[PDB]
Scaffold this active site. Structure first.
Site: not given
Ligand SMILES: Nc1ncnc2c1ncn2[C@@H]1O[C@H](CN2CC#Cc3nc4c(N)ncnc4n3[C@@H]3O[C@H](CNS(=O)(=O)CCNC(=O)C2)[C@@H](O)[C@H]3O)[C@@H](O)[C@H]1O
Ligand SMILES: Nc1ncnc2c1ncn2[C@@H]1O[C@H](CN2CC#Cc3nc4c(N)ncnc4n3[C@@H]3O[C@H](CNS(=O)(=O)CCNC(=O)C2)[C@@H](O)[C@H]3O)[C@@H](O)[C@H]1O
Ligand SMILES: Nc1ncnc2c1ncn2[C@@H]1O[C@H](CN2CC#Cc3nc4c(N)ncnc4n3[C@@H]3O[C@H](CNS(=O)(=O)CCNC(=O)C2)[C@@H](O)[C@H]3O)[C@@H](O)[C@H]1O
Ligand SMILES: Nc1ncnc2c1ncn2[C@@H]1O[C@H](CN2CC#Cc3nc4c(N)ncnc4n3[C@@H]3O[C@H](CNS(=O)(=O)CCNC(=O)C2)[C@@H](O)[C@H]3O)[C@@H](O)[C@H]1O
Lengths: 262, 258, 258, 262
Positions: A45, A120
């Site tokens: 993602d 997002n």
């Molecule tokens: N505390 C937080 N908790 C939850 N989400 C968070 C948090 N902080 C940031 N984010 C999201 O990260 C996006 C940025 N990120 C790309 C992605 C993505 C993504 N989008 C969706 C979606 N729509 N639904 C469901 N899962 C989704 N995920 C999953 O999330 C994980 C990535 N986050 S990380 O590895 O914890 C650290 C941040 N990572 C980055 O640098 C790149 C992966 O497993 C991915 O598969 C931002 O846009 C926030 O949204």
């Protein structure tokens, strides 16, 4: 049609890309890195967002597809790549559109306005000190927020950061945007709503600084520093991201598979 | 045209209703509580919810007005009742619609209930276990105190106390919220609230007990031999007669912030 | 005896300090900011936290008094400063102790920090992933924005905004709270806050990045090459000079309820 | 010593009981159903609570042991039953004590006071209508609560209902009790603390009715209706439950195994 493919960078994703490009050649299909019509993302993602933002200026002429290598926005496993080249070459797909969030930042004496589109969410945090902004909804001074920051999410973005903040999950057919708080302070001198808020397509949320005017603004995987911010504007974008879908993967089922086991 | 007035019951609410009936008596306004086109509620939201359910079989023909004597659904203070009489006599109002929740219970007929705030499902007394089906997807098996399915305008009520989100009433959707769910190594619920669009069906199907304490707004009744509860945005809406601008986010501000 | 007074810096706080020094000048009260037995703080909790960290190497020899000009740690209003001068000159006070958090950071020496409110750990800028070891147990691998470890008296501060609990200061414990943790099909944290007793050690050990933005009360510094953070109830306590009854639950009521 | 065993009721638990009684006989150990010293529970945490409350009047003379058949309070798997009979007959165990919560209910013109001891928690809910009580902490009118009810948990009880309410997990060595809210209403006319509260060994929380005086009071797996309630008093009990432990199963590890996988 014209297509391009973005790779995550690892050896697996790259080879899958080349191999897909080799299959695409066999079907008289042209790789166009500048003005494609199908954008394929191979990775996670994070990689999908990278591709979305790589082509945010031609979202009306592009239909994205994701292949998960290590994926909320993915619909294809790598072993299905050859099948995807075929179905794609045959035009056996239906376009589907999710809503997007427009973020406008007004800053400086020149009152420059930078506009960002997010898949997002967009978040707002201070420069290190106290974060205090007035939340204006249309013509209403709703609250003066004090805390770690504010998150504004798309429907498809509610399953990411929004979720971690206690926000709600919205079906992507609801053209709305959701506002969640980050560690808001609440006593008798300061009060917030404390509840997530969901705004419809015609509403505009305007974050306005109260004291310090520097803010760390994130847009999806990005995080920009803006100085002398006067306003951060949030609204459902008129533009929508288009997905080329070939089979049924309902949103809730995608929610089920990501967070619910057995 | 035809109207009626329902009162909370206290002395003040009762007299105010009498005074308004006397004012309407100077215009071509017919008191008719069988087939009213305008229903006026004098009291709290509890009064307003009661009036709504007293005429749920003719929501397509009625415009509701609320007079507050916390009044989330009331647009009118008691001192301005006389002004309301004239403005309503003059037809100086527009009609705004709010979405509603359809609640269907089927047994082993099929009872259907419209809701303005929400519908919750709890257990008769023992353990509450129900499978949550969304459309054609078995989403989760919920284990907790119960579940709450609210309208947009109900999100500021019980849904808010549960941690749900506030949705502007222009969105035709319903939100589901858990009540003290269980999450251990085995049992697993989503936790997050859920917001469904108008074309989705949320079906709750029993696992063990088939008796459920089912609520619709201010009404709560023990339903036995329940085979399913189905929630979905109702094709029907509640219509208010609006005289001055009073946006939803403003009412939310006045009710919770300052 | 020896005392000192530290001021927030504004005109009012500065003059009040000058006035009190002039009052103490009528008693056998020696101004000494190198080796004070009484430290008086005039300002907000931010001032009080600053005074505490200015003398953390002699907490065993100092009794803190707070004068508020939200003052959770202040027991005195500015108008009663003159009364405080006399009552303190007369030795008309008892000593109450609050527990503190020991924060240890070891690299690849070993920096140790005492905390009165809390210590939080966030990421330099990228993804925050750290394993949480409790004593000899690998409890969970946390994935989120960060972690907060607060004292009893800090539970009403940042810990409260995170959803933690308020603990009466008579309990020698520390509470850990998550910051926007991730919970999907793979990543799994406890979610609930954690309250540890005095004899337990909470060790945070990096997985990927070894640089952490580490905070102790009002201080926040980028620590690099971090190999471990260890939290544990400090053997040391902060001592206040108490003159009148002001129970903890009362201060909590006045700060949040009414 | 004298022992007894409570069965859950299913065929498995019953036979394990008899078999343990057969082994206990082989070691000159006496089954005493009236005044035992070791109480063994075979079943789940519901069964363990049933046994605790079966012997709440001799908690100072009893050391409980649990065998999980289908268990937070269990330390033994059924296949270990023969080993447990031996180690028990040899006296190879160490007694360990967890705190308990005293619940006092004053009700009626006679001002009767029923006292209950709880291992998990005690909760207070209304008779069906609105729940409104004043929360008095010692001599302080802390708040007037309006909502679904109030939960007061022991340290070992924080991993149950308390957890589901957002409460915190307390190590059982902290002789405290924790108060969590159930769907509290919060606007401008009504306010609650909204945060869980942890009270020390010497503090007393006194719930006092405001309007209606009927309440549904639960004590662990039980739920009693009390009419004309004047006060519900909560405090850390002087009495403690004793466990006979033969090996190291730290509390957090027990927390880890119950809620944290992989
Ligand atoms: N505390 C937080 N908790 C939850 N989400 C968070 C948090 N902080 C940031 N984010 C999201 O990260 C996006 C940025 N990120 C790309 C992605 C993505 C993504 N989008 C969706 C979606 N729509 N639904 C469901 N899962 C989704 N995920 C999953 O999330 C994980 C990535 N986050 S990380 O590895 O914890 C650290 C941040 N990572 C980055 O640098 C790149 C992966 O497993 C991915 O598969 C931002 O846009 C926030 O949204
Ligand atoms: N734990 C709970 N927390 C929050 N709400 C709850 C809870 N339990 C039930 N409800 C709601 O009560 C409605 C029924 N109720 C009439 C109303 C209403 C109403 N609707 C809205 C709305 N849409 N937005 C904003 N505020 C709204 N309110 C206000 O709410 C208060 C009433 N709650 S009470 O007096 O504490 C106990 C229960 N009350 C009744 O018997 C009659 C009043 O100030 C009212 O003005 C149900 O429908 C549930 O939703
Ligand atoms: N999102 C947050 N939410 C809640 N608390 C937070 C958050 N971020 C940091 N903190 C705490 O701030 C302390 C540092 N801070 C001095 C103090 C203090 C203090 N301590 C207590 C206590 N023990 N109990 C009850 N109220 C207490 N308060 C009150 O808190 C307010 C200060 N927060 S601020 O002005 O919004 C921004 C940050 N402030 C600073 O720079 C200086 C004041 O009204 C103060 O009176 C850290 O230690 C964190 O804990
Ligand atoms: N919404 C709720 N969420 C969480 N806990 C709740 C909720 N409602 C009640 N409780 C607890 O139930 C106890 C009564 N109960 C015996 C037990 C127990 C027990 N104690 C502990 C502990 N200390 N730590 C960790 N897990 C523990 N569990 C586990 O809990 C489940 C039982 N709950 S149930 O099957 O969902 C419905 C209620 N069941 C009964 O009638 C008998 C089992 O898997 C059990 O193993 C009360 O005392 C509340 O605490």
């Amino acid at each position: 049609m014209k297509y391009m493919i973005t790779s995550k960078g690892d050896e697996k994703s790259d080879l899958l890309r080349l191999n897909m490009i080799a299959g695409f050649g066999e079907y008289d299909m042209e790789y166009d890195d500048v003005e494609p019509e199908i954008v394929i993302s191979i990775g996670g993602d994070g990689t999908f967002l990278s591709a979305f933002h790589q082509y945010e200026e031609r979202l009306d002429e592009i239909a994205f597809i994701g292949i998960h290598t290590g994926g909320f926005y993915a619909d294809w496993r790598p072993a299905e790549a050859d099948k995807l080249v075929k179905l794609l070459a045959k035009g056996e797909y239906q376009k589907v559109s999710y809503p997007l969030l427009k973020t406008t930042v007004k800053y400086g004496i020149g009152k420059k306005e930078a506009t960002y589109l997010a898949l997002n969410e967009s978040t707002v945090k201070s420069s290190g000190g106290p974060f205090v902004v007035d939340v204006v909804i249309n013509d209403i001074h709703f609250e003066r927020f004090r805390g770690d920051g504010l998150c504004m999410s798309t429907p498809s973005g509610t399953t990411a950061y929004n979720k971690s903040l206690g926000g709600a999950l919205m079906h992507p057919s609801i053209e709305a945007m959701q506002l969640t708080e980050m560690a808001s302070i609440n006593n008798r001198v300061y009060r917030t709503i404390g509840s997530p808020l969901v705004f419809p397509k015609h509403h505009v949320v305007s974050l306005q600084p109260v004291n310090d005017k520097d803010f760390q603004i994130s847009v999806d995987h990005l995080s920009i520093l803006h100085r002398d911010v006067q306003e951060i504007r949030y609204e459902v974008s008129a533009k929508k991201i288009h997905f080329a879908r070939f089979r049924s993967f309902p949103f809730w089922r995608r929610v089920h598979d990501s967070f619910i086991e057995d």
